[PDB]
Structure formats: structure tokens, C-alpha cells
Amino acid sequence: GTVNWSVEDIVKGINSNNLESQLQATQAARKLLSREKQPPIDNIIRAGLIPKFVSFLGKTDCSPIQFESAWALTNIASGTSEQTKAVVDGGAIPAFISLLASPHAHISEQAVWALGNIAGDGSAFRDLVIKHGAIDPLLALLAVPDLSTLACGYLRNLTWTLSNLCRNKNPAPPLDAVEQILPTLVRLLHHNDPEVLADSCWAISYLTDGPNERIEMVVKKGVVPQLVKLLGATELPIVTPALRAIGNIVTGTDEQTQKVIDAGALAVFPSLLTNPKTNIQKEATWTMSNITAGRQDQIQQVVNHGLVPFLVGVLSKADFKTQKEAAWAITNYTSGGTVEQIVYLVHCGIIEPLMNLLSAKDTKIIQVILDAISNIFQAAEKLGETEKLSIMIEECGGLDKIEALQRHENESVYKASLNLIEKYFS
Numbered sequence: 001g002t003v004n005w006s007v008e009d010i011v012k013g014i015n016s017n018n019l020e021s022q023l024q025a026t027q028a029a030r031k032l033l034s035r036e037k038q039p040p041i042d043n044i045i046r047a048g049l050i051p052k053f054v055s056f057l058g059k060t061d062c063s064p065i066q067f068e069s070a071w072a073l074t075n076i077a078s079g080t081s082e083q084t085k086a087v088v089d090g091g092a093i094p095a096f097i098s099l100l101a102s103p104h105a106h107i108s109e110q111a112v113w114a115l116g117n118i119a120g121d122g123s124a125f126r127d128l129v130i131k132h133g134a135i136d137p138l139l140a141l142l143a144v145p146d147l148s149t150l151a152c153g154y155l156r157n158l159t160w161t162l163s164n165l166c167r168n169k170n171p172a173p174p175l176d177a178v179e180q181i182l183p184t185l186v187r188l189l190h191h192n193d194p195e196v197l198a199d200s201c202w203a204i205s206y207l208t209d210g211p212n213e214r215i216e217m218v219v220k221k222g223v224v225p226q227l228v229k230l231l232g233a234t235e236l237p238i239v240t241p242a243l244r245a246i247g248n249i250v251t252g253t254d255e256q257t258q259k260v261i262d263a264g265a266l267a268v269f270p271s272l273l274t275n276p277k278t279n280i281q282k283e284a285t286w287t288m289s290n291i292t293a294g295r296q297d298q299i300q301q302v303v304n305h306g307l308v309p310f311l312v313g314v315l316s317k318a319d320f321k322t323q324k325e326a327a328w329a330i331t332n333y334t335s336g337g338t339v340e341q342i343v344y345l346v347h348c349g350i351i352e353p354l355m356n357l358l359s360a361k362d363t364k365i366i367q368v369i370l371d372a373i374s375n376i377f378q379a380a381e382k383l384g385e386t387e388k389l390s391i392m393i394e395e396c397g398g399l400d401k402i403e404a405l406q407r408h409e410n411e412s413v414y415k416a417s418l419n420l421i422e423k424y425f426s
């Protein structure tokens, strides 16, 4: 019926003085833009069709053409950034926002999807969607007693669009808009559907990606326990953003970090630090590195949960990027830990896998490790044990690796490599 039209025929139809001929051609445009192998999006834009589509959004009297042009537009908006730009420059935004209140859910859903692609494109369009007043009628669509009564795809759609209004930085979303969206987000974070849960987690991880004031307004809503619980989920699409949000929160103050520990997060980490998925292991170690950079009582809680052997583990064998995070975790730990805590880290076997990494030709992990070896020696000084530690380091070929580091380009590598040699080796 409306399949395989040319662009010139779509144009002929959309230009006629006949609403039905136009509906027909609009639907033809929609199918053409929906095709899987390269849809002629730029041919449609060049044909001048977007202002016509956008004007059909207003045809209250003809809901089917509202729907087809809506859909045609979202196919273009979901394309590249300049394609999205074309849609916004057609005056689509206030037109789509008016459609959120449409009696027809198939049309409201379409406007939700459109707005999510426009907002998701970047900071300026996100903020422009918010200025045109999108947030109120978006939140109005979830003002039901129980979310379980909404259509599943409809709910995933709204959730996904809210996550895009939380997304991007420079600038981050307006505080006013975040505070307005945040309560609905908390509610969706408790909804039982894996995709609504993944999108909400992403929303939260976008909001926690910033300065402590931002982390605070999220933490203050009490989502951290629900985050930790999702950190435990079986679905990798839920764990991945849940771990990102937790990882963000512990880059904040000691008190915010402590909220995560109190929530029971550390009990999940033996799994996370041995996870078969490389990125989960990378983010979990990065998270550990921000927890061992906190207070001594927080370092101690890492110890009490039996997490130090898992750090020794990651340091020993992991993707190199994860090993770098692990070395940071160790340096932070050795930097702010008590003498007892640093001693324990040596008993768990940190020295040898530490030394092995001094063979990595990455200048900044070497700095980090040499700094860590230095912190450990200072703990050994307060016990007159620089002795035994030197022997340990010597026995796993750790001295050979530091001697040789007295011939590695970098300034700080020598002045530490040399210094260590002078100070603790004959």
C-alpha cells in the first residue's frame, strides 16, 4: 500500500490539497525512514519535508497524520546530531510537548520517544527541551497509584526519556529540573521490570557524575540501599549502571562514601572483583580505590569484609586497565592506612604482584607502585623492619626491577627508584 515510495512521490503527495493524500504520503515517508538498511534520512530533509511533518503534528482533527508525522520525525531525530538539529530547527519541540497530552496513547508515546532523542543529543538541546516545559507533562504521565497498571513498553519509554534529561555535562542538568525529576526516578528504581530498572540506574549514575553537591541531592533521597540491592542483580544491564552510580557516590565525601558501606555494598564485591565481564571488574576496582582513599575506619571495613585478598587477586591477574585501578587502590590504602593495616596487606601477599607490575612500560602505574612501595617502607621503619621487607622485595626479583628503573626516561621514576635503592638497599 504505502511501501517503496520514491521521495519525489512522497513530495507530490504531501504537497497536494488533500488531507487523505497527505496522510497517505506521510505514512509512506514513515515506512521509508523506518527501513533497516540506510534509510534516506538526508534525502527527506533535503526535500524540505520536516516543516510539513512538524505542521501535521498540530492537526488535532486528524490524529492518524499526527501519529505518522510524529513517527517520521522521531526516525529522523533518532539519527545523527545534525539530523536531530534539523528536527529541532523545524519547531518540533513545542509541538511534541503539546502531544504529550494527547488522548491517544500511541501518539503520546511517540512524542515521549521524540523528546528523549532530542534531549539525549546534548546539553543545549536537553536544556532547550526543559525550557519549553517538557518535564511537567512527562511526569504527569506517571501519576498513577501503581506503575504496574501502565503498559510495559510505554513505561520503559518514559523511563528512558527521563534518563536522557538527566544526561550529559558541561553543563550538568539544572538543579531545579533534577530536583523535580528525582522523586519520580526513585519510584521507578523500585519498579519491577529489568529495563525500567536499567534506565533508572543510568539516570542515577548520570546525576551522581559530578561535584559532591550533586551526589548529595541524590544520596539525600535515600536511593543508596536500593542501588546496592541492584548491584546484586543477575542482569548485567542492571549491574553495570548500578555499579557506575555507586562508583560515583564514593568519589564524594567520607560521609557519602560511608552511606554506601552502611548500605552493605562491600559484601557484593568479592563477586564484582572476580566478575567474568572485564568492565564490571574494572569499575569495581576503581570503586575500591576510592574507598581505600577514605578514612582508616573505612580502610578497616574493606579489611573486615575480606576484600584485601581480592585486591591482591586483581593485582596479580586482570586486564591491564583493571590492574592500574588495583595499583591505585593499593597506593591509596598504603597512604592512609594504619601500620597494622599496611602490615596485613603485606601478609596477604601484596609485594610480589606489586613488583611484577614494575615491568609494565606505563610510566604512571610505575610512579603509583613506587609510591606504594615507599609508603610500605615507612610503615616498616616504625617497626624496624625495613630489613625483612628489603629481603622480601629482593627475593621476588623486585630489586632488579627497581635498579633497572634507574634507566627509564622519567624524572620522578628515577628520583624514587634511585632514592629507594639508596635508602633501603646497602
Ligand SMILES: NCCCC[C@H](NCc1ccc(-c2cccnc2)cc1)C(N)=O
Binding pocket: 250, 251, 252, 253, 254, 257, 286, 289, 290, 291, 293, 294, 325, 328, 329, 332
Ligand atoms: N572518597 C574520596 C574520593 C577521592 C579520593 C582522594 N584522592 C585519592 C585518590 C587518588 C587517585 C585515585 C585514582 C586515580 C585514577 C584511577 N583510579 C583511582 C583515586 C583517589 C582522597 N580522598 O584522598
